[PDB]
Amino acid sequence: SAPVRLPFSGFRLQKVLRESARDKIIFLHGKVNEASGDGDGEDAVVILEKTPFQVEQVAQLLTGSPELQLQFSNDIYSTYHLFPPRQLNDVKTTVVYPATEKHLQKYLRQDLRLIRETGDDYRNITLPHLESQSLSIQWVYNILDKKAEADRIVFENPDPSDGFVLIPDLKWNQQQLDDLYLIAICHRRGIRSLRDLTPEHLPLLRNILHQGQEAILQRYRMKGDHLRVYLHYLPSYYHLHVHFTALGFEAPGSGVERAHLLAEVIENLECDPRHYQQRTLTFALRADDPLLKLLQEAQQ
Amino acid sequence: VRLPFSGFRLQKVLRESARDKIIFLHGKVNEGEDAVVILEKTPFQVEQVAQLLTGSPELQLQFSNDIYSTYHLFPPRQLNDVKTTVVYPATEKHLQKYLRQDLRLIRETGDDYRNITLPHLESQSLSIQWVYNILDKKAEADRIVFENPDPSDGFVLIPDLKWNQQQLDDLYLIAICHRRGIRSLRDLTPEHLPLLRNILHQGQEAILQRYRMKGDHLRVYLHYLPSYYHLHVHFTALGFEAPGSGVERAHLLAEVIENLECDPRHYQQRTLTFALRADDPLLKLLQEAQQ
Numbered sequence: 206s207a208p209v210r211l212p213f214s215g216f217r218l219q220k221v222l223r224e225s226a227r228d229k230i231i232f233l234h235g236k237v238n239e240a241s242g243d244g245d246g247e248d249a250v251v252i253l254e255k256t257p258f259q260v261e262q263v264a265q266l267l268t269g270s271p272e273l274q275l276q277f278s279n280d281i282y283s284t285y286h287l288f289p290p291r292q293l294n295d296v297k298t299t300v301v302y303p304a305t306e307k308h309l310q311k312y313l314r315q316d317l318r319l320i321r322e323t324g325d326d327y328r329n330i331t332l333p334h335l336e337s338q339s340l341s342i343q344w345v346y347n348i349l350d351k352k353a354e355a356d357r358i359v360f361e362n363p364d365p366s367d368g369f370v371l372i373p374d375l376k377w378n379q380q381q382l383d384d385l386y387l388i389a390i391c392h393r394r395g396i397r398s399l400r401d402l403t404p405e406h407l408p409l410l411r412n413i414l415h416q417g418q419e420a421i422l423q424r425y426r427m428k429g430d431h432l433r434v435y436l437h438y439l440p441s442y443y444h445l446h447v448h449f450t451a452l453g454f455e456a457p458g459s460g461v462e463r464a465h466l467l468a469e470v471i472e473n474l475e476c477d478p479r480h481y482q483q484r485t486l487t488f489a490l491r492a493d494d495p496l497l498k499l500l501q502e503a504q505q
Numbered sequence: 506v507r508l509p510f511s512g513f514r515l516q517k518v519l520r521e522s523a524r525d526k527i528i529f530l531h532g533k534v535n536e537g538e539d540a541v542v543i544l545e546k547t548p549f550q551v552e553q554v555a556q557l558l559t560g561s562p563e564l565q566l567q568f569s570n571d572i573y574s575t576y577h578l579f580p581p582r583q584l585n586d587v588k589t590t591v592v593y594p595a596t597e598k599h600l601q602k603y604l605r606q607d608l609r610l611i612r613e614t615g616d617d618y619r620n621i622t623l624p625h626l627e628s629q630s631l632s633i634q635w636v637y638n639i640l641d642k643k644a645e646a647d648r649i650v651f652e653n654p655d656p657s658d659g660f661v662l663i664p665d666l667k668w669n670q671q672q673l674d675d676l677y678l679i680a681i682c683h684r685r686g687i688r689s690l691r692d693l694t695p696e697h698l699p700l701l702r703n704i705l706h707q708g709q710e711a712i713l714q715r716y717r718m719k720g721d722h723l724r725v726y727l728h729y730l731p732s733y734y735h736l737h738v739h740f741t742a743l744g745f746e747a748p749g750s751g752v753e754r755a756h757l758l759a760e761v762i763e764n765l766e767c768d769p770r771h772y773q774q775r776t777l778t779f780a781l782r783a784d785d786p787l788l789k790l791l792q793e794a795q796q
């Protein structure tokens with residue numbers, strides 16, 4: 206059977222978590238599985254995002270007879286409503302079910318605040334707090350165990366200590382290289398973030414950088430100098446992973462307040478073995494995040 | 506109801522943004538005459554999204570993993586609207602306005618800068634007279650928000666030209682140091698730490714006094730490569746993903762300060778990563794040298 210259903214029965218919109226006109230994305234909190242009519246459904250998050258244009262698809266459309274509705278016109282400039290064929294109309298849909306209260310908070314629209322976390326702040330405040338406020342990494346384990354997305358793996362170094370799995374993300378429809386996005390997940394368990402990195406991890410990091418880039422060149426004919434390769438801090442999930450993005454893709458999470466180039470991570474560890482245990486890291490938090498209050502009050 | 510021309514041979518993509526779901530196309534028409542066609546996906550309407558999702562929409566499962574799954578959603582015609590802008594006939598000036606070249610990443614070692622980049626910079630006529638006019642109060646003096654007048658440790662804080670200051674969502678100011686001869690990060694030593702600390706602390710305090718926005722709302726960073734070779738620092742609202750704030754170009758001022766405190770020769774010895782346009786002669790010079 207063609208899989209054509211959401212993973213639940215019925216969708217009721219509880220509230221809009223966040224929408225962006227410039228990004229053409231919307232985050233939805235839904236209530237599902239309410240066949241009894243008691244208004245007590247499970248939580249689900251549904252993310253909808255319009256897709257980028259495909260160059261040759263739009264080129265063929267413009268050379269024919271497109272369906273247009275005139276909006277504005279003045280001298281050489283004019284604006285239309287275009288209703289394109291089915292090919293240009295697909296909407297990327299991401300579902301989280303069952304969604305946790307943590308999922309509702311991370312997607313709820315909030316103003317951001319910057320914070321600078323010393324090595325001491327991490328050990329005394331952040332690390333104790335995140336242990337109970339972290340999302341499950343079962344999806345990470347499923348990929349490593351070949352329990353999910355095995356056919357989507359682009360490259361794998363199977364070594365338990367220095368190996369990793371290279372795989373597309375949730376969003377990249379793989380229809381164009383302009384928005385290329387892949388993630389590399391290390392096989393070694395227990396590496397929560399940059400804070401756990403030591404020179405012991407230099408072989409792993411070099412493997413991800415050089416084998417990951419070569420795999421992208423082999424599979425997509427995408428040269429290394431077309432790629433932005435980095436890590437997140439704070440990471441979304443506390444299992445070490447690296448982001449491979451097209452340089453021309455203004456990818457979310459590539460800002461300086463979250464992204465750390467993998468090549469510089471390697472060189473920092475080579476220059477100082479205790480770099481990411483002692484140095485201060487700067488990142489952004491939601492204004493109502495209790496971790497922000499804990500860090501702000503310890504810094505007084 | 507139809508386009509003001511017949512046929513469309515794509516000459517080149519002027520620019521594209523997968524993040525913004527927009528594309529700028531240069532086409533040859535009536536074959537040829539020049540035309541610019543801009544296509545942009547439209548934002549979601551909450552009512553249309555709610556009505557569709559509550560009533561069995563057409564979906565195709567891509568894959569699932571634990572509690573996560575991705576689908577292709579095929580909405581009705583009411584949600585597929587594409588904003589289409591046409592310039593016909595388009596001029597050479599229109600093409601220059603929209604065209605952008607692809608970006609290529611490059612890593613410049615300390616020796617690369619001294620042997621390759623700096624001789625290339627010196628071979629060009631890079632005028633920063635407009636910078637001197639601001640510092641000397643001969644232009645844009647009415648735009649200055651704050652000044653430390655010290656000739657060595659001082660600076661002028663000025664809003665970005667593209668910020669009309671009518672809202673704080675896109676807050677963007679620039680701090681230009683008074684001291685001359687500091688091309689970029691490459692010229693920084695611990696002797697500039699008083700200047701850099703002044704920019705960080707006095708700059709944030711001035712933005713708090715003038716815009717009622719405290720420091721943790723701000724992203725304070727420098728560019729490498731900078732657009733002009735006179736040291737300047739960018740102050741941007743954190744919620745504003747300003748161009749040039751990506752990891753491939755921005756350097757947090759606090760980290761620049763602490764790097765100089767940990768190693769005086771940091772920015773003369775360490776390798777810096779940045780993007781260049783594919784047609785930039787500096788890109789070829791660095792690639793040939795690194796061969």
Ligand SMILES: C[n+]1cn([C@@H]2O[C@H](CSP(=O)(O)O[P@](=O)(S)OP(=O)(O)SC[C@H]3O[C@@H](n4cnc5c(=O)nc(N)[nH]c54)[C@H](O)[C@@H]3O)[C@@H](O)[C@H]2O)c2nc(N)[nH]c(=O)c21
Nearest residue numbers: 228230344354372373374375376388437441457458570573
């Ligand atoms: C659960 N899961 C995660 N990922 C990817 O791993 C990374 C997680 S960390 P990141 O900081 O990039 O974003 P994040 O939203 S916390 O990831 P997420 O797990 O919550 S899924 C939401 C998606 O929506 C995108 N997003 C988020 N905010 C915005 C935004 O403001 N604007 C836009 N245009 N896009 C945005 C993200 O890039 C993400 O791809 C992402 O690249 C995910 O795509 C996975 N990949 C595989 N193959 N399978 C998995 O199950 C899996």
